[PDB]
Design an enzyme around this catalytic site. Structure first.
Site, PDB file in Angstrom:
ATOM      1  N   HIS A 203       0.876  -1.231   0.068  1.00  0.00           N
ATOM      2  CA  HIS A 203      -0.018  -0.027   0.154  1.00  0.00           C
ATOM      3  C   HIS A 203       0.721   1.205   0.000  1.00  0.00           C
ATOM      4  CE1 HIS A 203      -4.056  -1.869   0.870  1.00  0.00           C
ATOM      5  NE2 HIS A 203      -3.228  -2.885   1.363  1.00  0.00           N
TER       6      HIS A 203
ATOM      7  N   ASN B 132     -10.500  -2.105   3.519  1.00  0.00           N
ATOM      8  CA  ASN B 132     -10.289  -2.064   2.020  1.00  0.00           C
ATOM      9  C   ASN B 132     -11.229  -1.626   1.192  1.00  0.00           C
ATOM     10  OD1 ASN B 132      -7.373  -2.762   1.470  1.00  0.00           O
ATOM     11  ND2 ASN B 132      -7.657  -4.986   1.709  1.00  0.00           N
TER      12      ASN B 132
ATOM     13  N   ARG C 111     -15.068  -3.277 -10.730  1.00  0.00           N
ATOM     14  CA  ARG C 111     -14.808  -2.490  -9.414  1.00  0.00           C
ATOM     15  C   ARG C 111     -13.462  -2.799  -9.143  1.00  0.00           C
ATOM     16  NH1 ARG C 111     -20.004  -2.208  -5.523  1.00  0.00           N
ATOM     17  NH2 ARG C 111     -21.474  -2.146  -6.945  1.00  0.00           N
TER      18      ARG C 111
ATOM     19  N   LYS D 157     -20.471   2.941   2.768  1.00  0.00           N
ATOM     20  CA  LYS D 157     -20.725   3.371   1.591  1.00  0.00           C
ATOM     21  C   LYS D 157     -20.450   4.667   0.958  1.00  0.00           C
ATOM     22  CE  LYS D 157     -22.832  -0.950   1.072  1.00  0.00           C
ATOM     23  NZ  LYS D 157     -23.923  -0.649   0.013  1.00  0.00           N
TER      24      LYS D 157
ATOM     25  N   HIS E  91     -26.662  -9.634   3.424  1.00  0.00           N
ATOM     26  CA  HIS E  91     -27.240  -8.753   3.831  1.00  0.00           C
ATOM     27  C   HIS E  91     -28.822  -9.071   4.147  1.00  0.00           C
ATOM     28  CE1 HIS E  91     -24.492  -5.955   1.272  1.00  0.00           C
ATOM     29  NE2 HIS E  91     -24.229  -5.810   2.413  1.00  0.00           N
TER      30      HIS E  91
ATOM     31  N   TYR F 104       1.257  -4.344  12.085  1.00  0.00           N
ATOM     32  CA  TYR F 104       1.175  -2.953  12.029  1.00  0.00           C
ATOM     33  C   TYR F 104       2.113  -2.171  13.122  1.00  0.00           C
ATOM     34  CZ  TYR F 104      -2.516  -3.627   8.448  1.00  0.00           C
ATOM     35  OH  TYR F 104      -2.951  -4.129   7.360  1.00  0.00           O
TER      36      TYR F 104
HETATM   37  C1  HEM Z   1      -2.888 -10.841   7.752  1.00  0.00           C
HETATM   38  C2  HEM Z   1      -2.739 -10.163   6.693  1.00  0.00           C
HETATM   39  C3  HEM Z   1      -2.307  -8.765   6.813  1.00  0.00           C
HETATM   40  C4  HEM Z   1      -0.900  -8.347   7.091  1.00  0.00           C
HETATM   41  C5  HEM Z   1       0.218  -8.952   7.951  1.00  0.00           C
HETATM   42  C6  HEM Z   1      -0.787  -7.119   6.568  1.00  0.00           C
HETATM   43  C7  HEM Z   1       0.265  -6.130   6.817  1.00  0.00           C
HETATM   44  C8  HEM Z   1       0.222  -4.735   6.394  1.00  0.00           C
HETATM   45  C9  HEM Z   1       1.436  -4.005   6.380  1.00  0.00           C
HETATM   46  C10 HEM Z   1       2.705  -4.470   6.829  1.00  0.00           C
HETATM   47  C11 HEM Z   1       1.214  -2.734   5.940  1.00  0.00           C
HETATM   48  C12 HEM Z   1       2.070  -1.559   6.117  1.00  0.00           C
HETATM   49  C13 HEM Z   1       1.726  -0.713   7.088  1.00  0.00           C
HETATM   50  C14 HEM Z   1       2.780   0.614   7.080  1.00  0.00           C
HETATM   51  O1  HEM Z   1       3.785   0.703   6.720  1.00  0.00           O
HETATM   52  O2  HEM Z   1       1.784   1.762   7.461  1.00  0.00           O
HETATM   53  C15 HEM Z   1      -0.251  -2.797   5.424  1.00  0.00           C
HETATM   54  C16 HEM Z   1      -1.144  -1.837   5.209  1.00  0.00           C
HETATM   55  C17 HEM Z   1      -2.315  -1.784   5.038  1.00  0.00           C
HETATM   56  N1  HEM Z   1      -3.179  -2.669   5.112  1.00  0.00           N
HETATM   57 FE1  HEM Z   1      -2.490  -4.770   5.485  1.00  0.00          FE
HETATM   58  N2  HEM Z   1      -2.029  -6.511   5.979  1.00  0.00           N
HETATM   59  C18 HEM Z   1      -2.925  -7.584   6.106  1.00  0.00           C
HETATM   60  C19 HEM Z   1      -4.296  -7.697   5.757  1.00  0.00           C
HETATM   61  C20 HEM Z   1      -4.828  -6.453   5.233  1.00  0.00           C
HETATM   62  C21 HEM Z   1      -6.436  -6.519   5.150  1.00  0.00           C
HETATM   63  C22 HEM Z   1      -7.164  -7.696   5.235  1.00  0.00           C
HETATM   64  C23 HEM Z   1      -6.774  -5.195   4.866  1.00  0.00           C
HETATM   65  C24 HEM Z   1      -8.212  -4.654   4.929  1.00  0.00           C
HETATM   66  C25 HEM Z   1      -9.139  -4.786   5.822  1.00  0.00           C
HETATM   67  C26 HEM Z   1      -5.531  -4.428   4.965  1.00  0.00           C
HETATM   68  C27 HEM Z   1      -5.436  -3.119   4.689  1.00  0.00           C
HETATM   69  C28 HEM Z   1      -4.452  -2.281   4.744  1.00  0.00           C
HETATM   70  C29 HEM Z   1      -4.142  -1.035   4.352  1.00  0.00           C
HETATM   71  C30 HEM Z   1      -5.473   0.166   3.981  1.00  0.00           C
HETATM   72  C31 HEM Z   1      -2.854  -0.319   4.390  1.00  0.00           C
HETATM   73  C32 HEM Z   1      -2.478   0.744   4.173  1.00  0.00           C
HETATM   74  C33 HEM Z   1      -2.744   1.634   5.404  1.00  0.00           C
HETATM   75  C34 HEM Z   1      -2.046   3.044   5.064  1.00  0.00           C
HETATM   76  O3  HEM Z   1      -2.723   3.914   4.280  1.00  0.00           O
HETATM   77  O4  HEM Z   1      -1.135   3.595   5.748  1.00  0.00           O
HETATM   78  N3  HEM Z   1      -4.253  -5.159   5.153  1.00  0.00           N
HETATM   79  N4  HEM Z   1      -0.600  -4.188   5.702  1.00  0.00           N
END
Ligand code: HEM
EC number: 1.11.1.6
Lengths: 498, 498, 498, 497
Positions: free
Chosen positions: A72, A145, A200, A234, A302, A355
């Site tokens: 991301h 997400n 989408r 939404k 739903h 995180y």
């Molecule tokens: C178990 C699985 C997951 C792991 C280990 C994981 C790990 C990570 C890591 C390490 C980052 C980077 C964080 C940073 O440097 O700020 C990240 C970012 C992100 N992840 Fe996950 N992720 C996982 C699952 C998901 C899922 C299922 C979602 C959604 C519900 C998600 C949404 C996001 C988003 C939105 C970001 C970006 C946050 C930002 O804008 O700074 N991730 N993820």
């Protein structure tokens, strides 16, 4: 005058009518006499170490970059508020929900997934939609997400999945064999893969897409009663996607389409909003659910679990400095105030650790001290001290050990977590075969129409064609298990590309 | 009640009489229910990842330490102000001296040199006395010590000298062969070695020793005329040293004797002060001076260059948090405002680079963001941006390139540095054979009396006896050159130790 | 010649008869023409940036330091081997024990706890005794100390306990109020506090103390059967301690007594060894044990759980470079090969997380790449890649995701952990009120004699006297609860001091 | 398929009769199941005792290191440098000692402004850095595909890069920033003309030239010195991409350059460059019309002919990109005896910046990283410790100089060449050196009408998005170069506007 984003410097200049420009200084505040020429011995002589103005500025330039997010990396950010519109205090005691009309400041960052910092916005990939709620009970980070599900259901496979989605370790090139070898070997991905390759898969900017917490969470009320829930937000701007062709054109014409769109929308007063909902499932209903309610590859229909309105998310402020407010912002799923807790979703459980851990690396041990990350609507008081770049009073001379007889911070019993009794052996339970098709077939048959199915298949085949034949066969075998017409349509498209 | 230092927590508690204890929160400000027990599955079951309260605190505990200073690791800090008593505007236009009666906030840190963080205060070693002046023209860091001179005259030998003063690379023990092999091979050290092994070697705390800038600096007045100078700050408490026996006893009884002494003195209202003076040498005099006026192993005789009173240094405030205000403080000799500049002293030139360089490593790229290092009496405005742990607003949306047509910061002509003509070959000029004994002999002969000379010799012999015979001879040969009596007395003591 | 340690440099020189020195180079290997003088314009001119030899060296010097261990910062290291002398394969299948006579290389580091890097060795404090076994099944780190128990039984209090043992956040001085406020408030510390203030509190070096894994661990055999155990390594040199007077004198004379002692012993062929034993407890016995068998404040009576001989621990090699082999060594309790697992001891559980975590901060993400930490007797093959300072081939072009159809590493089912079924709620169970006096009373009465109890009380009163009276009372109340004589004797001594 | 795509397949095949390795943790402990985490019951929470998970996840969390402040997007390769001619009369550097002498090299090509996930085929200069692993240590010739640069003083470099990058608030590319800087600093005219010409977008890395750009100093065996320029002309020939095609490729394949180079080497099509030097005596340096140390100036070939020296050959691809490419570090200050710096202000600034930025991006001990280690030289000195200190840290060797215990000694033959200087130690203005003469020679003599047309269209195409006042200033500078240059751009601007 062009778009507001383009006029950033002009507007900055104009806001400073009384043009008395500030004095240019070194990092230590010393005034600089000439920052356009370096110090040399004579006109054509060597540079001297004595030129500290030079070193001071160059040393900082040399240190401007910090590691990008492991996933991301490419994103956009904005700020606004969350406003309660309905009463859900029967489910959660969280202060952020305590009264209808109560506003809580929020920080948001949208993003793609696989691409690095200099990649394009308009590409097929899920989208990040993280929300930071600065509540009185500390920060609440809902890291969602643009989809209600995900590709896998066990966190130990996440690094591998992301690896397969990124670059080849030797060639540094995107590798479809990697992409599809993993996906074909792990059919749990069928649900999200289907969402991804649909219309989408490429939203028209960040304002025209939904947001979901995805995971199942737990809500606790004042009486200590708990229920499981889902968070949905939404888009009030309505869903709007980009065609494969337009997305391709834009990724070249404006790789920062998403950033520009959001900045200009806000700059001109078109503040985007999302209607906030929750789905509720009692502990009793969790026992009867036809699937695992904590399986991240499953949604709660739903029909059986209606969306319950809660509030609104409004973004009305652009960042003033992108690096400071967006690049440095950090969201931790584990940041939850009393009233909102985690569920046994293996995926959520894994994120509880990941995180804060990754933040301590790319940002630093004291990342919560960074303004945008600071829980400024709560008083942080504890027994944590020091660490690199300790930017505050480090809590002064307050006693640093607990318990103590000197009046330092005390634990508040009411904040204790909700306890559940679990039974079974402590071991690694396989979940690779936890029904990877049922809901996917429902999506294919019932949610999509003919035109949408045709595009889905064309999109899948368009990318899968570059993977080896044996990988294509295993992938098609999986789509066929979802629905025989799904797999055959893809196989037909593959046949002609081949 | 005992000394103020001992009653630190007790006083903190009392000052919060009519108050309720704060709520113990996580780093993100979420209230904690029970921070005395972890979450386990059953009374004797395993620990859970869900216990984010535990890992949030532990993770921070795991990251509390930062690298200590490569040298001068052991120290004490205090704060106060600098007041101008006399008018030296004819010599320097620096704002810190602009008018009689003007007060400027300061920060000070005292220290030893070779010992690490857990070493004793009362040990023979020079003493650091760094002063940070928070002026309107940025911070002015006068990083001095308790001696007007140093052991070497070329910066490229500093890393080697320090290594020789520290631990053996294999055994990790203090090594007298290292110490004396270097000193004996580099006789320019005779002057500072003589000062070190005299009574002045172990000051009675930090309040009973002088402070010196050591290097020759350059002052520039409002007309652009410049002169060379020395900075001197004499103790108003009077010079007091500790005997070898008392220093050894104390190093065992109270390894933090200097920290305690200073804290208690300030806590009881006995604010220590130093009278600030300067020595002036015109460019014309610099040419006729018997030695290299920029040779750090030489002093400017008081008879020929009298001390001109400038002001006072007063310490009236104890740090509230040692880590944030003392451990994290950073002084850069290169931090000089208009009116004060460096001289060609090779040692100072080397220091112009080393300090901010080691600070970017020890504290971090944005170490100037840390409160105690922030030039808060000045306005920082430039084209530097980003970097790890970027605080504040990162200068907002201001144009980040110079020059620009958008009203961003502008260079100030009056801040331009003073120019000096230089000519010659650009190469490494050997200074090993400059005068290494003349001034040393004057010290041994006139500055010290018979009783003091005796101690000097037994102090030297006491440590030197543990070095090999060949090293002893070489060292004695050096002492003999300073004065036959100096070398012979030492040899006499060595003879019996052996 | 003197002792081997002192002759380190001499021996190095000697091991090079035909002394033609190697060429002095920059970090990049470029030969240096003169590393004794810097480049200036003219003999008395400024320093040039052009002098890269200077900067290259100075810049490295400026970065020599890394954060010291958050605890156990002061220590010594040595290398040797572990040899199996008895067959215990009936309890554990670990390769390290597979057959009598089997030798496995080991790395060891001894240390104190509270003091920083420049602190004294001969002080009252427990001692660290960590062992790194380089097995074929990877590294096994048995991170022990010289006592079978610890001060607390829940990991969440560790950061606080450590804080109370270190310096006051404001004064930076050791604080007896902090030390005793914590201990008196947490009487579970009585057992280890009694051991600490006894003669074993200050061992005569590292060779004359015992080693203990302390925690209860789990052993699993080939059949998949499991038992609980305790690790013990008794000193073959015999127990020997330093009197309070001698320890004090030595903290002044030689702060590095333990380092010198160990180095010189190995250097002269007097290789220290320890006899390795284990105590075994069945799961059935764990159900009937009078106390919690996983409580760090309890020991397993030898009468009921006899020592079972396993092998020998021999240290026969000194470090060649302390920083590289000792300062950078990292032990992780979580480093356990098949056949050895953790027990539900809350304290051990917490350590499973803390060590690797702190190591990623102190050393770096790839700290396992540092030679001394590398599991060199095992083949590292996985899907982990990149990270700062990646010093290997980074596993080349091998497929970076799992599962894959391209021949990358596969999991080994035989390595799967032992599974137990636990019951009860998932919450925070209070253990503050578990038995805090029973085993302590036995220690005071049976383990010690009249002469030892006298010293114990004097040592405790000697330090406790400086805490406020209310703290003295609370502490004595706890001691009295252990045994009337214990409490009244300390109070009697406290009365004279006050 | 192309070799690049079959990477994994080939890897699998090379391990025909092999059998997979046992999957382990970082500490070498065998892993029983790395596909499911430890939970209490099939639907219970995650346990801390699952170290297999933490060990792997914690490392994944730390995979990223900061990208290069500039030139972040690139491709790497390896090979050798072979001497074909004798220039020992000019330099004593061991790398040039005899015809046929081969020295291993590491090369990294790149763009400038874009970040890691950006496109290869975009207008921007190109990086062409060469690391020669010589017996006298590493020699880093950090070059570009142009003999000049946009500025002549290093203190303006951070600002220039800032203007070339993203707006601090919007995080968008900003043409006002780009052109406000260029129009205010007309010394950029020369390199801006190169940049906006057909060579602004090369067809891959194999079809472009490389230059050291700066004037350097060569010292021979009898301590005599001369100034020089390094030039490495492409043996594959100059080949560029049209604006339309570059745009298409930036969308179709952002990693075009990476792929092209990899496949080329993979299929035996080893790219090479002919290495030359230009020589200017100290006397000619006095007579030169401009400042010979001015980065915005070139030495005309007629007066300073290209003297052939050798060949650069790239015949080996990286086995691991992160390890050999992302982590590679070139320091201009890395020069062995026989090759020295010149008073070029820009070069002097680079002497500091690179090692400095490397200690931040990679770490204090970055020279310990394999690809950066001077493996064909014996490193011996008094430097010790530092984070991630690999190696033996030089063992128990005396760590101070000088010493009486036989540790490393300085070598007098390695002393730098000394020159006499005279003047005030101050900030001399170079903003008004000639900024147009050589530029005019480029526009008029080097280019033809088609090319000038393309040049003006390229410039106007981008410049059209800046404010009018910026447009006028820019056009004013172009007009000073040649009336026809500015008028044509203005006429195009009039149209876009
Ligand atoms: C178990 C699985 C997951 C792991 C280990 C994981 C790990 C990570 C890591 C390490 C980052 C980077 C964080 C940073 O440097 O700020 C990240 C970012 C992100 N992840 Fe996950 N992720 C996982 C699952 C998901 C899922 C299922 C979602 C959604 C519900 C998600 C949404 C996001 C988003 C939105 C970001 C970006 C946050 C930002 O804008 O700074 N991730 N993820």
């Amino acid at each position: 005058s062009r778009d507001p984003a383009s006029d950033q410097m002009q507007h900055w200049k104009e806001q400073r009518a009384a043009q008395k420009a500030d004095v240019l200084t070194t990092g230590a505040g010393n005034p600089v006499g000439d920052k356009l020429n370096v110090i040399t011995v004579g006109p054509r002589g060597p540079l001297l170490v004595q030129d500290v103005v030079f070193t001071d500025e160059m040393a900082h330039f040399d240190r401007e970059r910090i590691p990008e997010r492991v996933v991301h990396a490419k994103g956009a950010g904005a700020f606004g508020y969350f406003e309660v519109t309905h009463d859900i205090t029967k489910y959660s005691k969280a202060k952020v929900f305590e009264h209808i009309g109560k506003k809580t400041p929020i920080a948001v960052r949208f993003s793609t997934v696989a691409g690095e910092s200099g990649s394009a916005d308009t590409v097929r990939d899920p989208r990040g939609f993280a929300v930071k709620f600065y509540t009185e009970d500390g920060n609440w980070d809902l890291v969602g997400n643009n989809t209600p599900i995900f590709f896998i259901r066990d966190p130990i496979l996440f690094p591998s999945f992301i690896h397969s989605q990124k670059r080849n370790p030797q060639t540094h090139l995107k590798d479809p064999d990697m992409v599809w070898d993993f996906w074909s070997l792990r059919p749990e991905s069928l649900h999200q893969v289907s969402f991804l390759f649909s219309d989408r898969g490429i939203p028209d900017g960040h304002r025209h897409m939904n947001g979901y917490g995805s995971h199942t969470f737990k809500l606790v009320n004042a009486n200590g009663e708990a229920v499981y829930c889902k968070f949905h937000y939404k888009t009030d701007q309505g869903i709007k996607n980009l065609s494969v062709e337009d997305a391709a054109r834009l990724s070249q014409e404006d790789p920062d389409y998403g950033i520009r769109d959001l900045f200009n929308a806000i700059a001109t007063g078109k503040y985007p909003s999302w209607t906030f909902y929750i789905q509720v499932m009692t502990f009793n209903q969790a026992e009867t659910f036809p699937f695992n309610p904590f399986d991240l590859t499953k949604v709660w229909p739903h029909k059986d679990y209606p969306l319950i309105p809660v509030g609104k998310l409004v973004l009305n402020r652009n960042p003033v400095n992108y690096f400071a407010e967006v690049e440095q912002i950090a969201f931790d799923p584990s940041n939850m105030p009393p009233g909102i807790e985690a569920s046994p979703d293996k995926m959520l459980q894994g994120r509880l650790f990941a995180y804060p851990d990754t933040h301590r690396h790319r940002l630093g041990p004291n990342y919560l001290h960074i303004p945008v990350n600071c829980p400024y609507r709560a008083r942080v008081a504890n027994y944590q001290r020091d660490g690199p770049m300790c930017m505050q009073d480090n809590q002064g001379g307050a006693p640093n050990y607990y318990p103590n007889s000197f009046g330092a911070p005390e634990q508040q019993p009411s904040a204790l977590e909700h306890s559940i009794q679990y039974s079974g052996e402590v071991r690694r339970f396989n979940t690779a075969n936890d029904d990877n098709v049922t809901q996917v077939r429902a999506f294919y048959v019932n949610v999509l129409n003919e035109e949408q199915r045709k595009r889905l298949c064309e999109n899948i085949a368009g990318h899968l064609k570059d993977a080896q034949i044996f990988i294509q066969k295993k992938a098609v075998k999986n789509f066929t298990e979802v629905h025989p017409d799904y797999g055959s349509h893809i196989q037909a498209l593959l046949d002609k590309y081949n």
